Design a protein around this ligand. Sequence first.
Ligand SMILES: O=C1Cc2cc(Nc3ncncc3Cl)ccc2N1
Ligand SMILES: O=C1Cc2cc(Nc3ncncc3Cl)ccc2N1
Ligand SMILES: [Cl-]
Ligand SMILES: [Cl-]
Lengths: 4, 4, 124, 124
Amino acid sequence: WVIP
Amino acid sequence: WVIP
Amino acid sequence: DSCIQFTRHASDVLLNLNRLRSRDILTDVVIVVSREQFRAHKTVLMACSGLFYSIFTDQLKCNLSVINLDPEINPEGFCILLDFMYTSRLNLREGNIMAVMATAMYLQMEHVVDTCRKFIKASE
Amino acid sequence: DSCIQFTRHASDVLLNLNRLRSRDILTDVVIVVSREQFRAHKTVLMACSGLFYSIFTDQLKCNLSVINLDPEINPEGFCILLDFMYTSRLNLREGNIMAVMATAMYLQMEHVVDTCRKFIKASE
Ligand SMILES: O=C1Cc2cc(Nc3ncncc3Cl)ccc2N1
Ligand SMILES: O=C1Cc2cc(Nc3ncncc3Cl)ccc2N1
Ligand SMILES: [Cl-]
Ligand SMILES: [Cl-]
């Protein structure tokens, strides 16, 4: 999971 | 395009 | 093999499937949650959820145009997860995390359940 | 927004759609090429091809279970492009590049047409  |  | 690969292909496909959903193009099922209705594509639901995969591979249920979810399922939690299925983006907030995790457990969306568990553990 | 994003989501969706294609699950159309038949999902074909997008948004053709391609279309070129749609992998070879480019132009798959043009220009 990432900060888009 | 890339070499997978 | 000796194939070449287009890096952005999978993302472009998903973006187009979401554009079809927005315009209600070729949607083939209605998901009913606490009298809130959500139109979607069976194949996308199956590709994202162990529950929908099981439902639409069943010889009788594969032909249903309406699926009713368990009354304990929260429509907002479902809406957030449906958006995630079509975009890879999850709108996870302090105010919705419990409903989102409960919905992801029911839908069998293991990666969503994993990040909800981690976000809850960080707040304790 | 304040969304989080699962990097591998789009790729995982496409991999599952290809698994459904392999097992012939929820395929809703047959594409006929020079008496060679290919089963697929209309939504995936639309998400990948400007031609199929135009075909399945047409009020009469959206309801067809069989689509016949132009007789000049090569079945192998189509097969390679159908595989690309479902995998992001293109089996481009000296022996098939002309058929693949001609098929991609007809199907309106601009990124495939682009790499074929570049690979042909490198060999001249
Ligand atoms: O967490 C998850 C996400 C998910 C998706 C599916 N889908 C499929 N699996 C295998 N072949 C085809 C399909 Cl469509 C099954 C189980 C789970 N569990
Ligand atoms: O090269 C290409 C690839 C491609 C895909 C599509 N598909 C869609 N476009 C917009 N909204 C939904 C969909 Cl399904 C249209 C044109 C082209 N041209
Ligand atoms: Cl997931
Ligand atoms: Cl393309």
